[PDB]
Design a protein around this ligand. Structure first.
Ligand code: HEM
Ligand code: HEM
Ligand SMILES: [C-]#[N+][C@H](C)[C@@H]1CC[C@@H]2[C@@H]3CC[C@H]4C[C@@H](OC=O)CC[C@]4(C)[C@H]3CC[C@@]21C
Ligand SMILES: [C-]#[N+][C@H](C)[C@@H]1CC[C@@H]2[C@@H]3CC[C@H]4C[C@@H](OC=O)CC[C@]4(C)[C@H]3CC[C@@]21C
Lengths: 467, 465
């Protein structure tokens, strides 16, 4: 029986570009194809991994095999040709700067530079500014941005900004610009639209990165006179020292600049996003918010301000931060990895140079590893009696794992806990007067961001009477 | 057999569709330049020709110098205190007089208005220059500059960079403007009283923050005031009360007058600057001529001064054309008949609200050539060597008893901001090509949608520094 012919197929993708969130689109495909599959774009083959078993083989068991980074035209501009840490390929450059960066956080282990003290100082500044807005609905994005930017500038240069220093608006402006132009889908851009049609994405990215580089360069030069081999106390000292003791090819001035830029961008954008997400979920869940005010008042009161040691007491607050980092991870697909050598994932072959994506969203929403994964439930991280924190699932990796794992996790966890505890001790946070709630859908950029929203700020009466 | 339906109400256009001032203007084709509308028991008269407008504001200004009472205006003005929304009477008359007498304290000296103004503009230009090569919204830096100028006129104080109080003011200013009215204070249908809403409660909560902030300043000034140092607006008001009428100089009355001056000085000037920048982004040809004008007449050996209004004629005509096309108050503030009177020989009863449609006057096709078009040249002789007044149908600052009292301040603020900015900065379209929408948002002030501008330090200024 004759039959019409099937049309020649020159290309095929399993979902529509720019429709839906990529991480969720990859996760939905796991019903059809399993937890690991590949897609080819020209000559580049990419592998997506969506189960914690296989993710741990990529990140840990074989971490060094898959520690590379793929080269992207956008990340080249941002990383000054793959310098820095996050977007540098595995190699001597990345191995050294990563280690020196991790070593700087020991300069702030304890003493007067104890991170908790640096953080609580800026948090005090932030809470004071916020209190002037008593009774008003405001967007707290910038006040937080300034606080974390000062904590990071103290770690990097032992310098901090003064209220109103226009530099803070200049950085805000080129951070905004680069994040808006770098990627529209969690750094996983299947189709290379940038190279098919005429656009100015790369030209915009250069403009913003020029202002960033020139600003950092001005600081790094004015610091060449301040430096003393006897006084290493910040990240810039650590780097400048190794350059003197040298290799010196690796610690060039552009290499140092770009490595500082990564720490700054990483430390400000991630932390500020997660605070905003946490506020948003509490506006949608006043029942959790009420319980957090009760916990913070019974365990800390108002005689003092929260300290890191309160982490052992404010368990629901720690469970909320954990639940927010599960639901809305800062990087729902981490940063793309790359196979440094021929290797394998779950017995499947993977050739050298293959881009490997870990779908963190899939891991955090596996219906077999989590009860009601779509729901904001801080209790999932506490025992039934709410007296002890737990780890309900092994499919939980907000900070990654292995050689490319996060180096600022300690800082981030202290900033988050303290910001939230200080804010909750002093302020009622309510829906703005016109009743709008933030959309919890999110915008998947290099960072998984939430749409800007306003919050009604009111100084709590319990905290007022206590004065 | 078939009859017409009983008709219980009729309005000549659809509420909340289009801009009111323009809907009123369109109706003149059909009804003439003056007609009336009756809402319940309140009759309102709309006036749309310069001849009749000048009879209401000037020839009969005293007959029509009242203000209609509105629930929303009552909250903003603490029950019709202040000046702008105060009914004609002793209170309004005295405070307006004292507010105007305050500007003579700044006619010359170390505190000459041009010195106060140029100081702030210098700070603004230094802040804006840090943004070299970036696209920004210049709303807040201007708001802060002008808030400092007015604060210096009222208290001889200014805010330092970063003072969170400026964000607090910006917040409740935005809140009050957003909830005061949706259409130039000419809200025909009283929706606020028909359906459940929280408009008046949002306004109260914003005004409370304003009143509390102002009260703190005023009661901390009682410990500063001296009879021998009268140098600002608060001094002028306190002296009058010391020399006393004193019943009209209550603390609330002084607060509300100061509130009116701060709000009027800051939100009007900030809007006009944003409107001027928008039009030049749409008219690069005018923008180039301005750069050429200022370069040849002021150069880069010094910053512009007020005396430069004699040479920067295109800049002065551009400002005039922006106040014609996008008046801060397209329908002024509503007036009211204090007595039984007449307009154009028609009877107007006492208590009748009377609205002057300035938009109609400024777009009259018989009085202006291509009134829809942005044409700074219309205010210069064909040779571009002297400013002219091409029509009598031009009243951006009102006229008569309720006319603007800050015109002089505003005209110097506007001229100097633009001159300094054009001397030093290239102002161009942001990187993604978006241009501002010139349609506007008719609120208590005729506002322009928020937009951004790429700011760059000019090479001429650079080289010459
Ligand atoms: C809640 C906050 C944060 C979360 C959830 C987070 C998560 C992550 C993730 C998902 C990655 C990619 C992991 C991978 O490729 O396997 C990463 C890497 C990185 N993180 Fe963060 N991060 C946070 C905060 C911070 C802070 C405060 C800093 C700096 C002080 C920082 C510095 C970095 C850097 C420099 C990298 C690049 C590391 C590399 O490629 O070797 N992060 N982090
Ligand atoms: C471009 C800037 C400005 C424009 C176009 C403008 C225009 C106007 C207009 C049209 C009126 C209403 C006239 C009427 O109701 O018949 C008015 C009134 C008023 N203006 Fe302005 N004005 C400006 C700036 C200022 C400034 C800088 C101040 C104070 C420093 C100020 C203070 C006032 C006050 C207090 C009134 C109320 C007068 C009264 O009701 O007796 N304005 N202005
Ligand atoms: C964790 N995490 C995240 C996975 C990463 C950490 C840092 C890293 C980059 C580093 C560069 C920087 C440039 C800054 O724009 C100018 O400076 C904007 C913000 C970035 C793009 C951040 C965004 C988060 C990241 C991808
Ligand atoms: C000319 N003109 C202008 C068109 C008018 C002059 C002043 C007047 C009022 C006075 C009160 C003030 C309260 C401020 O909110 C807190 O302070 C917000 C801004 C206002 C509402 C301004 C708006 C402009 C005006 C109607």
């Amino acid at each position: 029986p004759k039959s019409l012919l099937s049309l020649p197929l020159v290309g095929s993708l399993p979902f529509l570009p720019r429709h839906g969130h990529m991480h969720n689109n990859f996760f939905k495909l796991q019903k059809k194809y399993g937890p690991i599959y590949s897609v080819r774009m020209g000559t580049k083959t990419t592998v997506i991994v969506g189960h914690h078993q296989l993710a741990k083989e990529v990140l840990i068991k074989k971490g060094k095999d898959f520690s590379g980074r793929p080269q992207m035209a956008t990340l080249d501009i941002a990383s000054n040709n793959r310098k820095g840490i996050a977007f540098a390929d595995s190699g001597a450059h990345w191995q050294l700067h990563r280690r020196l960066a991790m070593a700087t956080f020991a300069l702030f282990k304890d003493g007067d530079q104890k991170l908790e003290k640096i953080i609580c100082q800026e948090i005090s500044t932030l809470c004071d500014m916020l209190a002037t807005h008593n009774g008003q609905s405001i967007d707290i994005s910038f006040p937080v941005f300034v606080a974390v930017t000062n904590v990071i500038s103290l770690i990097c240069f032992n310098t901090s900004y003064k209220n109103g220093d226009p530099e803070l608006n200049v950085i805000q402006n080129y951070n905004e610009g680069i994040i808006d132009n770098l990627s529209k889908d969690s750094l996983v851009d299947l189709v290379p639209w940038l190279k098919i049609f005429p656009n100015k994405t790369l030209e915009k990215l250069k403009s913003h990165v020029k202002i960033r580089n020139d600003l950092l360069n001005k600081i790094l030069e004015n610091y060449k006179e301040k430096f003393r081999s006897d006084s290493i106390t910040n990240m810039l000292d650590t780097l400048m020292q190794a350059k003197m003791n040298s290799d010196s090819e690796l610690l060039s001035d552009n290499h140092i600049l770009t490595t500082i830029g990564d720490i700054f961008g990483a430390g400000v954008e991630t932390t500020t996003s997660v605070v905003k997400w946490t506020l948003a979920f509490l506006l949608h869940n006043p029942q959790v918010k009420k319980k957090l005010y009760e916990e913070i008042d019974q365990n800390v009161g108002f005689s003092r301000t929260p300290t890191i040691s309160d982490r052992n007491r404010l368990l629901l607050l720690e469970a909320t931060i954990r639940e927010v980092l599960r639901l809305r991870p800062v990087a729902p697909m981490l940063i793309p990895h790359k196979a440094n050598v021929d290797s394998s994932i779950g017995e499947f072959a993977v050739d050298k140079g293959t881009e490997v994506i870990i779908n963190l969203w899939a891991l955090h929403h596996n219906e077999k590893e989590w009860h009601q994964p779509d729901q904001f439930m801080p209790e999932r991280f506490l025992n039934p009696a709410g007296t002890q924190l737990i780890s309900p699932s092994v499919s939980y990796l907000p900070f990654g794992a292995g050689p490319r794992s996060c180096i600022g996790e300690i800082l981030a966890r202290q900033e988050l806990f303290l910001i939230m505890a200080w804010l909750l001790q002093r302020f009622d946070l309510e829906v703005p007067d016109d009743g709008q709630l933030p959309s919890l859908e999110g915008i998947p950029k290099v960072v998984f961001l939430i749409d800007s929203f306003k919050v009604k700020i009111k100084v709590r009466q319990a905290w007022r009477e206590a004065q």
